[PDB]
Structures are given as C-alpha cells and as structure tokens.
Amino acid sequence: ENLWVTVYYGVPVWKDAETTLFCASDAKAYETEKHNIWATHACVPTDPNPQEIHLENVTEEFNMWKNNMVEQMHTDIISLWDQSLKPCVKLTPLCVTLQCTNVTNAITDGELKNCSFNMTTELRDKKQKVYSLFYRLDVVQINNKEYRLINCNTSAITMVCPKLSFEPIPIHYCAPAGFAILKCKDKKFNGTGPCPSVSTVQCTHGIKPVLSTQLLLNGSLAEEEVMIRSENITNNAKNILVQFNTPVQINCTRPLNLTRKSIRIGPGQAFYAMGDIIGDIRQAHCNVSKATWNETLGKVVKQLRKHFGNNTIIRFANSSGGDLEVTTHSFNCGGEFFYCNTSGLFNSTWISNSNDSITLPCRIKMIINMWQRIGQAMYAPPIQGVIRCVSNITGLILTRDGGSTNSTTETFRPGGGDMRDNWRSELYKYKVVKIEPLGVAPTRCKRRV
Amino acid sequence: AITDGELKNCSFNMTTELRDKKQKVYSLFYRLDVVQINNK
Amino acid sequence: VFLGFLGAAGSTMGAASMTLTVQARNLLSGIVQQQSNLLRAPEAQQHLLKLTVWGIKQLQARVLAVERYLRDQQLLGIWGCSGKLICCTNVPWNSSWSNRNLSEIWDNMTWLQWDKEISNYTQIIYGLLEESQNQQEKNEQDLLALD
Ligand SMILES: *[C@@H]1O[C@H](CO)[C@@H](O[C@@H]2O[C@H](CO)[C@@H](O[C@@H]3O[C@H](CO)[C@@H](O)[C@H](O[C@H]4O[C@H](CO)[C@@H](O)[C@H](O)[C@@H]4O)[C@@H]3O)[C@H](O)[C@H]2NC(C)=O)[C@H](O)[C@H]1NC(C)=O
Ligand SMILES: *[C@@H]1O[C@H](CO)[C@@H](O[C@@H]2O[C@H](CO)[C@@H](O[C@@H]3O[C@H](CO)[C@@H](O)[C@H](O)[C@@H]3O)[C@H](O)[C@H]2NC(C)=O)[C@H](O)[C@H]1NC(C)=O
Ligand SMILES: *[C@@H]1O[C@H](CO)[C@@H](O[C@@H]2O[C@H](CO)[C@@H](O)[C@H](O)[C@H]2NC(C)=O)[C@H](O)[C@H]1NC(C)=O
Ligand SMILES: *[C@@H]1O[C@H](CO)[C@@H](O[C@@H]2O[C@H](CO)[C@@H](O)[C@H](O)[C@H]2NC(C)=O)[C@H](O)[C@H]1NC(C)=O
Ligand SMILES: *[C@@H]1O[C@H](CO)[C@@H](O[C@@H]2O[C@H](CO)[C@@H](O)[C@H](O)[C@H]2NC(C)=O)[C@H](O)[C@H]1NC(C)=O
Ligand SMILES: *[C@@H]1O[C@H](CO)[C@@H](O[C@@H]2O[C@H](CO)[C@@H](O)[C@H](O)[C@H]2NC(C)=O)[C@H](O)[C@H]1NC(C)=O
Ligand SMILES: *[C@@H]1O[C@H](CO)[C@@H](O[C@@H]2O[C@H](CO)[C@@H](O)[C@H](O)[C@H]2NC(C)=O)[C@H](O)[C@H]1NC(C)=O
Ligand SMILES: *[C@@H]1O[C@H](CO)[C@@H](O[C@@H]2O[C@H](CO)[C@@H](O)[C@H](O)[C@H]2NC(C)=O)[C@H](O)[C@H]1NC(C)=O
Ligand SMILES: *[C@@H]1O[C@H](CO)[C@@H](O[C@@H]2O[C@H](CO)[C@@H](O)[C@H](O)[C@H]2NC(C)=O)[C@H](O)[C@H]1NC(C)=O
Ligand SMILES: *[C@@H]1O[C@H](CO)[C@@H](O[C@@H]2O[C@H](CO)[C@@H](O)[C@H](O)[C@H]2NC(C)=O)[C@H](O)[C@H]1NC(C)=O
Ligand SMILES: *[C@@H]1O[C@H](CO)[C@@H](O[C@@H]2O[C@H](CO)[C@@H](O)[C@H](O)[C@H]2NC(C)=O)[C@H](O)[C@H]1NC(C)=O
Ligand SMILES: *[C@@H]1O[C@H](CO)[C@@H](O[C@@H]2O[C@H](CO)[C@@H](O)[C@H](O)[C@H]2NC(C)=O)[C@H](O)[C@H]1NC(C)=O
Ligand SMILES: *[C@@H]1O[C@H](CO)[C@@H](O[C@@H]2O[C@H](CO)[C@@H](O)[C@H](O)[C@H]2NC(C)=O)[C@H](O)[C@H]1NC(C)=O
Ligand SMILES: *[C@@H]1O[C@H](CO)[C@@H](O)[C@H](O)[C@H]1NC(C)=O
Ligand SMILES: *[C@@H]1O[C@H](CO)[C@@H](O)[C@H](O)[C@H]1NC(C)=O
Ligand SMILES: *[C@@H]1O[C@H](CO)[C@@H](O)[C@H](O)[C@H]1NC(C)=O
Ligand SMILES: *[C@@H]1O[C@H](CO)[C@@H](O)[C@H](O)[C@H]1NC(C)=O
Ligand SMILES: *[C@@H]1O[C@H](CO)[C@@H](O)[C@H](O)[C@H]1NC(C)=O
Ligand SMILES: *[C@@H]1O[C@H](CO)[C@@H](O)[C@H](O)[C@H]1NC(C)=O
C-alpha cells in the first residue's frame, strides 16, 4: 500500500531514564521554629494536590534492587549533614587531662563519672577549674586517675549547634519537567518483574527520614499479609527485609533528670555539659509488649516456610559480634542517641506445631561517629529534663547463617549496618521514566504540493 | 667535614595530643629555607 | 475527554491521538511547581553557603528542561511543519521499514509497542524528512514565483 509518513508530537511513550530529583519538602510559616537540618535551604513548599492518574492496560517491569533513588538518597543524607555543620564550633580545647572520680559510694553494677579540668574565662590568659558529668563510654584512661576523651588522637569533635534540630520531617521526592515517576499498586509485589497496575505520580508520599539499625521505626505498612522480601534468598550475605501489616508499639524513656551548665569557650561561643542529677540514678530502658510480639512472630515464621519448607524448624538467635552500631538497636529520639540491648526479643524456637511487657536495657553515649569517616566525630548537647518517646515497629532486617550441614533447623538473626536497607524498603514501588514526544506513523495524508 | 653544607639539623617544641604539653621534635631543613635571627 | 498526564498510555494509536496537547504542556509548563525556587525571605548567616549549593541543583533542572525542549521544536522547522501538532510530510512509506497494513496498527496497537518496532529505523525515517522539504523550499517555490 502506498502510504506517507505523518509526524505526531505529544505521543504518550516512555524510555527508562536516570536523573536527579527534587527534594520538595512540606512547609509552613516557621516564624519561630529553629532552623531544621533535614529541610530548610534545600526544599521548596509542596504541591498540595498530587493527582494519581491511573493508567489502563499498562504493564511495566520494576526492579527495587537496581534503583537509583535509594542510591542518591544515601548520598543526599551525607551531604545534608556535611553542609549544615560548617559554621558549628569545634571542641578543640577539651583535649586535656581530667581529674575524675566515681559518683556513687556503693557500686551495684557505675554509669556517670565526675570530672574536673581547666577552662579559660573571658580574658584569655586566666584559667579556672570547671567540672562536668561524662558517661563512662565517652572517657578512656591515659595511664587521680587522669582521663581524657575517646578521640583526641584523630578526630576534631565538632559540637552540633544548639540552634539546630534533627527530627524526622517528610521529604517528597519530585521529578522536574520531562520526567515522571511511576508507582506500582500490585499488592503481591515482591520487588521484581512485571507490575500489572501502574499509575503516574507527580510526587511520592512523605517519607520520614529515621536512621536506625535492626528494626524499622515509623515505616510504611503492608496491605494484607506479612511481606518477606530478599534478593537471592539462598545467598547468605543478603539481608532479609520483613514488613508488617500491623504496627507493634514501643515505649522508651530516660528516667533520670538533668540540667545544663554553660561553660564558655570563646567570645560568643559556649559549650553545654551535664551538671547535676536532681533525683535518682536510673537506667534508660524500652518496653515491647510480649503478647503482640509473640503473635507478630507467628506471621514471619508462617511465610518463611513457603520459601524453605513446611516441616522445618525455625529458630531466632541474637547476634555474633561487632560494634554498638550493629549488635544493638540504635535510635535518634528526643535529641539523644540510645543503643538498646535486644537479646530479649530475638530468642525463641518454632516447631510447626495480657499486659506483661518485655523490658530492654539501654545505653547512652554522646560522642557518636556516624558513617565512620576518618577523623570526624559529632557531639549532641544534653537535653534539659527527662525524655519520652512512643514509636511503632514496622519491619525487621534479618539475615541467615547457612553453613553446609544436613540439619532441618534454620536460624535467623537481626542485621545492622548499611543504611541502604532503610531506604530500599520504602522506595521499592517506584521507577523514573522519560517522555519522548516525537513519533512517526504511516498514513494517507500527502502534504499537497 | 665541610667540602662545599646543604642540609641543617634543627630542634623545636611541638604540642602532643593534649594541647598543654610540649615535647622536643627535630627535622632536616635545607639551608635556603632557614635564616638567622641573631646555638645559634 | 482529558484523563490527565499520560492517561492515554494504554489506549490505542487511534484513541490516544486525541490527547496530544497534554504531554506537550506538561513537558514544559509543569515547571510551575518549580517557580517556587524564589524562596521565602531567608534569615541571617549560618548556612549562607547551603543556600547556593542547593541553588544550582534546582537550576540545572530548570535550564536542562528548556534546552532539551527547543531542539525538538526546532527539528519540526527543518521538516517544514512548525507549530502544527499534526503535520504530513509527503515521504513514501517504504515497505521494508515495517509491516502489516494500515488498519491493524490504529485499532489494536499502542504507541509504546509501535515505537519498539520502528525505533530501529528512526534515523533513516528522519533522513528523508529533511530532503523532501529542501527540494520544495529552494527549488519549487523560487521556480513557481518567477513562472
Ligand atoms: C516515630 O513517630 C512518632 C510520632 O510522631 C514520633 O513521636 C514524636 O516525637 C517528637 C520528638 O521531637 C515529639 O515532639 C515533642 O513532643 C513533646 C510532647 O510534649 C513536646 O513537648 C516537644 O516540644 C519541644 O520540642 C523541642 C524539644 O527540645 C523544643 O525546642 C520545644 O521548645 C519544645 O520544648 C516536641 O514537640 C512528638 O510529639 C512525637 N509525636 C507524638 C504524636 O507524640 C517519634 O519520635 C518517631 N520515632 C523516632 C525514633 O523518631
Ligand atoms: C519474585 O517474583 C518473581 C515473579 O513473581 C519471581 O520470578 C520467577 O522466578 C522463577 C524462578 O524459578 C521463574 O521460574 C523459572 O522460569 C524459567 C523460564 O523463565 C524456567 O526455565 C525455570 O524452570 C523456572 O520455571 C519464573 O519464571 C519467574 N517469574 C516470572 C514471571 O518470570 C521471583 O522468583 C520472586 N522472588 C523470590 C525471591 O521468590
Ligand atoms: C484496554 O484496551 C482495550 C483495547 O483493546 C480497551 O477497549 C476494550 O477493547 C475490547 C476489544 O476491542 C472490547 O471488547 C472492550 O469492550 C473494550 N472496552 C470497553 C470499556 O469498551 C479497554 O477499555 C482498555 N482497558 C480498560 C480497563 O479500559
Ligand atoms: C569507680 O568505678 C569503677 C567501675 O566499677 C571501678 O573500677 C574497677 O577498677 C579496677 C581497677 O583495675 C578493676 O580491677 C575492677 O574490676 C573495676 N570494677 C570494680 C567493680 O571494682 C573503680 O574501682 C571505682 N573507683 C574507685 C576509686 O574505686
Ligand atoms: C561532682 O564533683 C563536684 C566537685 O568535684 C561536686 O561539687 C561540689 O558539691 C559540694 C556539695 O556537697 C559543694 O560543697 C562543693 O562546693 C562543690 N564543688 C564545686 C567545685 O562546685 C559535685 O557535687 C559532684 N557531683 C555529683 C553528682 O556527685
Ligand atoms: C591514641 O592511640 C594510641 C595508640 O593506639 C592509644 O594508646 C594505646 O597504645 C597501645 C600501644 O600503641 C595500644 O596497644 C593500646 O590499645 C592503646 N590504647 C587504646 C585505648 O587504644 C591511645 O589510648 C589513643 N588515645 C585515644 C584518646 O584514643
Ligand atoms: C527535673 O528537674 C527540674 C529542676 O531542675 C524540675 O523543674 C522544677 O519543677 C518544680 C515542680 O513543678 C518547680 O517548682 C520548679 O520551679 C522547677 N524548676 C525549674 C528550674 O524549672 C522538673 O520538674 C524535673 N522533672 C521531673 C520529671 O521531675
Ligand atoms: C505505651 O504507652 C502508652 C501511653 O502513652 C500506653 O497506652 C495506654 O495503655 C493503657 C493500658 O492498655 C491504657 O489504659 C491507656 O488508656 C493507654 N493510653 C492511651 C493514651 O490510650 C501503651 O499501653 C504503652 N504500650 C506498651 C507496649 O507498654
Ligand atoms: C545473646 O548474646 C549475648 C551477647 O551478645 C550472649 O552472651 C554470652 O553468653 C555466654 C554464655 O553462653 C557468656 O559466657 C558470655 O559471657 C556472654 N557474653 C557477654 C558479652 O556477656 C548470649 O549467649 C546470646 N544468647 C542468649 C540466648 O542469651
Ligand atoms: C544483653 O542482655 C543479656 C541479658 O538480657 C546479657 O546477658 C547477660 O550477660 C551477663 C554477663 O555475664 C550475665 O551475667 C547474665 O546472666 C546474662 N543474662 C542472661 C539472661 O543470660 C548480655 O550480656 C547483654 N549484652 C551485652 C553486650 O552486655
Ligand atoms: C503508630 O501506630 C498507631 C496505631 O496504628 C497509629 O495511630 C492510629 O491508630 C488508629 C487506631 O485506632 C488507627 O486507626 C490510625 O490509622 C492510626 N493513625 C493515625 C494517623 O491516626 C500511629 O499513627 C502510628 N504512628 C505513625 C507515626 O504513623
Ligand atoms: C656550619 O656550616 C656553615 C656553612 O659553611 C659554616 O658557616 C660559616 O660561618 C662563619 C660565621 O661567620 C663564616 O665566617 C664562614 O664563612 C662560614 N663558612 C665556612 C665554610 O666556614 C659554619 O661554621 C658551620 N657550623 C659550625 C658550628 O662551624
Ligand atoms: C639530627 O639530630 C638529631 C638529634 O638532634 C639526631 O638524632 C639522634 O641520633 C642519635 C644516633 O647516634 C641517637 O642516639 C639520639 O637518640 C638521636 N636523638 C633524638 C632526639 O632522636 C640525628 O641523628 C641527627 N641527624 C643527622 C642526619 O645527623
Ligand atoms: C509464643 O506462642 C507460641 C504459640 O502459642 C508458643 O509455642 C511459644 O512458647 C510462645 N513464646 C515464644 C517465646 O515463642
Ligand atoms: C507445604 O504447604 C503448602 C500449604 O498449602 C502446600 O501448598 C505445599 O504443597 C506443601 N509442600 C510440601 C512439600 O508438602
Ligand atoms: C533466651 O531464651 C531462654 C530460653 O527460653 C530464656 O531462658 C532466656 O531468658 C532468654 N534470654 C533473655 C535475655 O531473655
Ligand atoms: C526500502 O528499504 C530498503 C532497505 O532499508 C532499501 O534497500 C530500499 O531501497 C528501500 N526502498 C524501496 C524498496 O523503494
Ligand atoms: C492485512 O494483513 C493481514 C495479515 O497480513 C490480513 O489478515 C488482512 O486481511 C489484511 N487486510 C486488511 C486488514 O484489510
Ligand atoms: C534491529 O536491528 C538489529 C541490528 O540489525 C537487528 O538484529 C534486529 O533484528 C532489528 N529489530 C527489528 C525489530 O527490526
């Protein structure tokens, strides 16, 4: 048939693409609100009306294990902290000798230590004795006795500004013009292959950036059942992402009361430290209910057995070593940094057939090094008053041991230190596409000479 | 025994980790990069 | 009916050719969500550098969206049909490019799977478009003027 090309512009076709998205946070007046590191000078106020245009007949292939949104969220998070902490004061004078001692007179199991050191007055030629109350994790020994901080060898401990506030605030990742984001709505999506229900979205829902290990706090829930999700299930070195359909609540506190000193450093730059224990010394702890935790493990075992076998025995162990960042459960709540001992949750067997809460003891330290960069460290100023937190547990990160024996007993352990498992468990249903408007098609049109 | 020297061997104080304690350190500076004030 | 942006992605070539103005205005004028980059009145110092490091990353996606748009609008001016969202270019459809017959294309194929078959030949289909227009503009129109 004798036909002639016609040219169409605006035709709805796609190619897969890679690009850099928009931070796009939510916004208010914030006239008295303290500058907040997660947003401010990075984000723009959010389209208040996302439109989820449901497509017909479209079947697209997604892959959550090769996504770039997870790979640039981990790069922005380092760049959001590293750009806020340029103006902040360095704590270089505090690398001195400390005349410290115990706080109590009768040791039961101590925690705090009471120190003494010199510090400059206003005029920088006069020296005075000042004290503070440092935790014992943040103090090491030189040789009555004389102590010093944990990192005077290599690191410059940058005091986090007091006008700052670190806090989960929902970031919406948006695409600029010429790009689009596609959302899966299939409820059985294990993470790869075709998604038979696709809808274009302007901007994703608001994920709350929380940096935790071994357990996923304030996450997004499943839809019908528990969703077990991993890459190459028979491979040991791959983590196993678990996602709940119902939240499991937690209650955390620091039950001792504290105030702040105001030991100055220089003209206009002070330093905060722990001053007094107004009350009684108590250990920080967290509660998980037991009847809800024993039923939430009744579902994770149930759908592990569809991947391994019905007649197998499924057991949970606790850990096998490492630093505090990967043997325990890390938080960021209320301005302090809790590292709770979770050897009481992950301890049971399963054999294929009211109000009593599980208490979790918990440590505190205030000189943290996040991402383990060489010669860098942070410092969290103390919070005046006791701290209270309430959170949900929506998900786990297990890992499988698997040596070469013949036994029918699998053992699953919680896993820690890689932040890309926190983000890959949230942006799994997305893909960015490119919009190519020109197209050609044969017809009977003939320009008319 | 001088034939025509080039390097010089020096000594000075330098702070340890704790910035209130001073120790003796040395180095080997070229003679073009060292001038005289007034052993010596 | 307008279903919104990309709503006709699963429809036929016949039924999705009704919606061509949607993917054109949202190819540029979806930037109205980016003109918020003139931000609120900033405070004093302490992160004055963070204000401009994140200012370039907002502006590379503004400029890159503009200067990828003009080179696809200009290319329609080379073929002889600028402005029109539908033009006809008077180049014979060689039957080695594709297949069946005219009528199983517009009734039960989508543009996405159509684009797959003809993507292999797109640089030679774009080759004849700039040749059947040059023969008309410099030869025919200056001859039909004086004759
Ligand atoms: C998981 O999500 C939960 C639910 O949102 C979240 O709990 C929230 O924690 C924040 C912690 O900042 C709470 O905010 C505080 O709430 C108390 C309640 O009395 C207020 O007093 C606080 O006001 C102070 O805020 C600053 C603290 O110094 C001061 O600058 C200020 O002047 C006030 O003194 C503050 O608003 C928030 O209320 C809860 N949410 C609920 C619903 O209770 C939890 O933190 C998340 N988990 C993790 C690990 O982040
Ligand atoms: C997540 O879901 C996807 C799809 O639901 C799973 O992909 C499926 O993987 C199995 C692996 O055995 C594929 O079966 C094999 O197919 C090949 C031919 O493609 C055949 O030679 C083999 O004998 C076997 O039948 C299956 O095709 C594939 N699904 C699709 C739609 O292609 C994936 O395994 C799931 N992930 C996990 C961890 O279970
Ligand atoms: C998916 O595309 C089809 C085109 O094949 C749409 O139209 C249907 O076409 C079949 C076969 O031509 C008819 O039997 C149906 O009656 C058509 N649908 C309607 C509503 O008339 C179809 O509509 C598209 N899918 C959806 C969900 O709209
Ligand atoms: C302050 O508390 C610490 C923590 O218990 C005490 O540390 C002891 O240090 C000695 C020194 O070698 C060790 O042999 C002990 O094992 C440590 N623990 C205990 C429980 O004795 C320290 O003794 C306390 N300070 C003073 C002055 O007694
Ligand atoms: C930590 O040690 C300091 C001194 O090293 C204690 O401060 C003293 O408290 C007594 C109260 O009986 C006062 O009479 C002294 O004048 C204080 N000394 C100074 C220099 O202020 C402080 O009480 C200790 N803290 C704890 C929790 O034991
Ligand atoms: C700074 O580093 C030195 C070297 O590691 C620490 O001193 C001790 O040095 C001996 C021999 O070099 C090691 O076997 C010890 O393990 C070191 N002790 C510790 C606690 O690491 C010194 O303590 C370090 N100082 C600080 C503040 O970390
Ligand atoms: C923690 O300690 C502070 C004091 O440092 C307590 O605040 C006092 O509370 C009483 C009772 O309401 C008031 O009479 C005082 O005026 C308060 N003092 C200050 C400086 O504000 C606070 O209540 C304590 N927190 C807890 C939970 O016991
Ligand atoms: C965590 O703390 C909350 C309180 O903030 C607890 O909620 C209360 O639970 C008791 C017992 O069921 C009820 O009588 C109260 O009415 C609840 N408070 C509210 C505001 O509804 C919750 O039980 C705690 N969770 C755990 C696991 O201990
Ligand atoms: C849970 O983990 C802890 C440490 O993380 C293990 O504790 C050790 O238990 C053995 C007894 O088999 C003791 O000899 C060790 O001293 C303990 N370690 C420490 C650091 O104290 C424990 O075995 C694990 N399992 C259970 C079921 O508690
Ligand atoms: C985490 O908690 C467990 C218990 O919940 C700790 O195990 C205890 O370890 C000490 C050290 O010898 C023993 O005296 C106790 O008998 C152990 N408890 C039980 C129930 O066996 C474990 O050590 C804690 N983790 C760390 C790192 O200390
Ligand atoms: C943490 O979990 C609780 C329990 O789901 C959430 O609180 C609400 O609980 C009621 C139960 O009566 C549900 O119907 C609501 O859907 C829950 N959400 C809201 C927004 O009301 C609580 O919101 C969870 N925390 C977060 C941060 O989402
Ligand atoms: C170290 O070497 C220098 C370089 O030769 C010697 O410098 C002499 O300094 C005296 C002082 O006035 C001059 O008069 C000489 O001309 C210099 N050169 C020579 C070759 O003598 C210096 O003497 C040497 N140090 C010592 C301690 O002898
Ligand atoms: C530079 O001078 C230093 C001392 O000023 C010399 O170092 C001494 O070398 C001797 C070797 O015979 C050692 O016994 C001493 O302990 C060293 N002193 C110190 C402080 O380490 C060094 O050898 C000189 N360099 C040259 C090239 O002559
Ligand atoms: C939880 O419940 C199951 C079934 O009722 C029971 O076998 C088990 O002992 C309980 N406790 C734990 C720690 O699994
Ligand atoms: C395991 O149990 C499931 C439950 O329905 C069943 O479909 C499957 O056939 C069982 N497999 C074996 C090997 O018994
Ligand atoms: C671990 O399990 C054993 C056996 O059920 C139990 O006796 C022990 O208390 C558990 N450990 C912790 C820390 O609760
Ligand atoms: C059609 O295409 C083939 C190969 O692309 C070419 O050899 C031929 O000259 C074209 N034109 C015809 C058959 O008119
Ligand atoms: C077009 O071609 C197909 C198969 O090559 C044939 O079945 C049909 O009769 C042809 N003619 C039409 C649709 O007019
Ligand atoms: C596309 O071109 C390649 C290279 O010649 C060829 O192998 C392939 O068959 C072509 N596909 C189509 C649909 O023409």
Side-chain angles (χ1 to χ4, degrees):
Chain A
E1 184 68 29
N2 203 7
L3 304 178
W4 292 268
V5 174
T6 189
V7 172
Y8 285 125
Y9 183 78
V11 166
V13 295
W14 303 333
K15 296 293 179 182
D16 300 338
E18 294 183 350
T19 190
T20 300
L21 297 175
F22 246 28
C23 146
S25 157
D26 184 304
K28 303 291 189 291
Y30 295 116
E31 60 271 16
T32 57
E33 192 69 28
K34 336 179 37 161
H35 268 220
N36 161 293
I37 172 200
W38 298 98
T40 86
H41 341 267
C43 279
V44 6
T46 22
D47 193 0
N49 290 315
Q51 300 296 321
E52 186 179 356
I53 304 301
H54 181 81
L55 303 188
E56 69 186 9
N57 284 326
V58 169
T59 300
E60 284 289 323
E61 291 182 352
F62 292 166
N63 189 0
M64 59 175 285
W65 302 101
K66 299 295 180 183
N67 191 353
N68 58 350
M69 295 173 73
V70 182
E71 298 293 327
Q72 75 170 356
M73 193 172 185
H74 180 63
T75 303
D76 286 336
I77 292 169
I78 295 171
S79 181
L80 288 174
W81 279 92
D82 204 1
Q83 294 175 3
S84 295
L85 297 178
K86 285 173 69 68
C88 295
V89 179
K90 298 287 188 180
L91 304 178
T92 48
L94 284 168
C95 186
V96 295
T97 306
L98 305 176
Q99 301 292 324
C100 302
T101 186
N102 310 87
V103 172
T104 57
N105 62 358
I107 294 169
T108 65
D109 192 2
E111 297 88 5
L112 289 165
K113 308 294 284 187
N114 195 359
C115 294
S116 175
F117 55 96
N118 286 321
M119 179 53 71
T120 312
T121 65
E122 295 84 358
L123 305 169
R124 57 185 298 275
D125 55 353
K126 292 174 175 62
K127 307 292 183 180
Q128 60 181 355
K129 296 295 183 189
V130 198
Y131 61 94
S132 65
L133 293 167
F134 293 148
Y135 287 96
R136 67 182 292 168
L137 287 169
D138 297 337
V139 170
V140 77
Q141 183 177 1
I142 299 168
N143 287 315
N144 49 1
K145 298 288 181 182
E146 292 167 353
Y147 290 169
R148 66 186 177 181
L149 295 177
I150 198 70
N151 286 320
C152 276
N153 278 327
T154 61
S155 301
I157 298 166
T158 301
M159 182 181 77
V160 138
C161 321
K163 69 188 173 250
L164 286 169
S165 67
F166 43 88
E167 185 72 26
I169 290 294
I171 294 103
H172 303 272
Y173 285 87
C174 281
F179 285 141
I181 298 173
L182 301 171
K183 171 164 72 176
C184 188
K185 290 191 286 187
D186 193 2
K187 63 184 178 182
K188 291 182 182 180
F189 183 68
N190 63 347
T192 185
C195 174
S197 180
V198 181
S199 68
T200 74
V201 177
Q202 287 90 22
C203 297
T204 182
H205 67 87
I207 179 59
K208 291 174 180 290
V210 56
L211 293 170
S212 69
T213 58
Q214 295 187 1
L215 290 176
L216 306 177
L217 299 178
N218 283 328
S220 296
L221 295 175
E223 291 84 1
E224 287 182 351
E225 294 291 330
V226 56
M227 291 299 295
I228 292 174
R229 178 177 286 118
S230 68
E231 187 172 357
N232 283 107
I233 182 64
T234 58
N235 193 357
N236 279 317
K238 299 290 185 179
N239 288 322
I240 300 170
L241 297 168
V242 176
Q243 188 189 6
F244 292 158
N245 60 356
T246 180
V248 176
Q249 200 178 8
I250 197 166
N251 279 323
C252 296
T253 186
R254 183 177 61 82
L256 75 156
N257 194 0
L258 293 174
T259 54
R260 301 192 298 184
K261 293 291 184 181
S262 61
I263 306 163
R264 77 173 67 249
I265 291 173
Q269 51 183 0
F271 167 74
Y272 287 163
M274 281 171 273
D276 281 322
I277 303 102
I278 302 96
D280 198 352
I281 294 167
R282 291 178 66 188
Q283 184 73 40
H285 61 281
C286 291
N287 279 325
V288 182
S289 181
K290 184 175 179 178
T292 63
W293 182 250
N294 198 18
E295 192 63 33
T296 310
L297 292 176
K299 297 173 184 178
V300 177
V301 172
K302 182 181 74 175
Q303 299 194 2
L304 284 166
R305 290 177 295 191
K306 76 177 185 184
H307 290 285
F308 292 97
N310 290 317
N311 52 3
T312 67
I313 308 299
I314 291 177
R315 190 187 68 180
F316 294 93
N318 60 1
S319 289
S320 63
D323 198 359
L324 283 178
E325 300 288 333
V326 296
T327 60
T328 55
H329 184 188
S330 173
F331 288 160
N332 181 1
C333 195
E336 288 185 355
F337 298 141
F338 296 166
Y339 294 136
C340 298
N341 185 7
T342 58
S343 66
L345 304 179
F346 296 93
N347 181 15
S348 68
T349 82
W350 296 84
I351 52 169
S352 292
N353 289 322
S354 63
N355 289 319
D356 291 334
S357 67
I358 296 167
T359 309
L360 300 168
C362 196
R363 296 175 184 272
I364 299 167
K365 68 185 283 186
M366 286 183 179
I367 299 172
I368 64 159
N369 191 1
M370 59 201 299
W371 302 291
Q372 285 278 326
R373 292 178 293 175
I374 297 171
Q376 299 184 2
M378 292 181 188
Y379 182 78
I383 302 301
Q384 178 170 357
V386 298
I387 291 175
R388 176 74 176 179
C389 297
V390 182
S391 301
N392 293 317
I393 297 171
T394 69
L396 273 67
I397 305 170
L398 293 171
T399 184
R400 180 261 188 96
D401 282 340
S404 70
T405 72
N406 58 2
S407 295
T408 57
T409 301
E410 298 288 329
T411 171
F412 297 106
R413 283 173 170 165
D418 191 73
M419 290 295 172
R420 292 178 292 177
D421 288 327
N422 286 318
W423 310 114
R424 194 176 290 120
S425 68
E426 196 72 32
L427 299 170
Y428 60 91
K429 62 171 79 75
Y430 291 150
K431 188 172 77 176
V432 178
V433 295
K434 184 180 189 295
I435 314 298
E436 281 86 0
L438 276 83
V440 292
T443 188
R444 47 186 60 243
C445 192
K446 288 186 97 292
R447 170 69 70 84
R448 188 182 288 118
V449 180
Chain B
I2 294 169
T3 65
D4 192 2
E6 297 88 5
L7 289 165
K8 308 294 284 187
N9 195 359
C10 294
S11 175
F12 55 96
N13 286 321
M14 179 53 71
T15 313
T16 65
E17 295 84 358
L18 305 169
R19 58 185 298 275
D20 55 353
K21 292 174 175 62
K22 307 292 183 180
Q23 60 181 355
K24 296 295 183 189
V25 198
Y26 61 94
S27 65
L28 293 167
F29 293 148
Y30 287 96
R31 67 182 292 168
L32 287 169
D33 297 337
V34 170
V35 77
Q36 183 177 1
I37 299 168
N38 287 315
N39 49 1
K40 298 288 181 182
Chain C
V1 63
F2 291 163
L3 299 175
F5 179 71
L6 287 172
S11 297
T12 62
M13 290 172 67
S17 67
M18 302 296 110
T19 60
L20 292 170
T21 62
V22 172
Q23 284 79 238
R25 73 181 72 191
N26 203 359
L27 191 60
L28 183 60
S29 65
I31 200 163
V32 69
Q33 299 301 320
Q34 306 184 0
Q35 294 182 3
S36 296
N37 290 320
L38 291 173
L39 305 182
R40 70 180 180 88
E43 290 87 6
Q45 199 186 8
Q46 305 294 116
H47 313 164
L48 188 141
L49 195 277
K50 189 169 79 172
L51 189 273
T52 64
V53 173
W54 288 93
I56 301 167
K57 293 180 184 179
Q58 292 175 355
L59 195 145
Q60 296 182 357
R62 292 168 66 93
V63 175
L64 185 65
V66 171
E67 65 192 2
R68 285 188 292 112
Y69 177 82
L70 288 174
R71 57 95 52 82
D72 290 335
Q73 193 61 251
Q74 183 185 4
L75 186 65
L76 289 177
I78 297 301
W79 297 344
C81 51
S82 179
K84 285 182 283 295
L85 292 178
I86 298 173
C87 72
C88 297
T89 61
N90 201 1
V91 169
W93 183 258
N94 191 8
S95 66
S96 179
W97 294 343
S98 186
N99 286 318
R100 47 189 73 249
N101 39 15
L102 180 150
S103 57
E104 291 179 348
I105 298 171
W106 291 98
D107 284 325
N108 55 4
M109 293 180 75
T110 63
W111 280 107
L112 273 82
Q113 76 181 7
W114 167 255
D115 186 74
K116 292 179 181 181
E117 295 187 357
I118 203 65
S119 64
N120 218 348
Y121 294 146
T122 304
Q123 296 296 320
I124 62 169
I125 292 171
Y126 288 176
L128 274 76
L129 294 180
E130 69 181 0
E131 288 291 326
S132 76
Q133 179 63 34
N134 279 321
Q135 292 171 357
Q136 183 178 359
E137 197 169 6
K138 73 182 170 63
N139 194 3
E140 183 172 0
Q141 295 184 357
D142 290 338
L143 284 172
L144 297 176
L146 55 88
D147 192 359

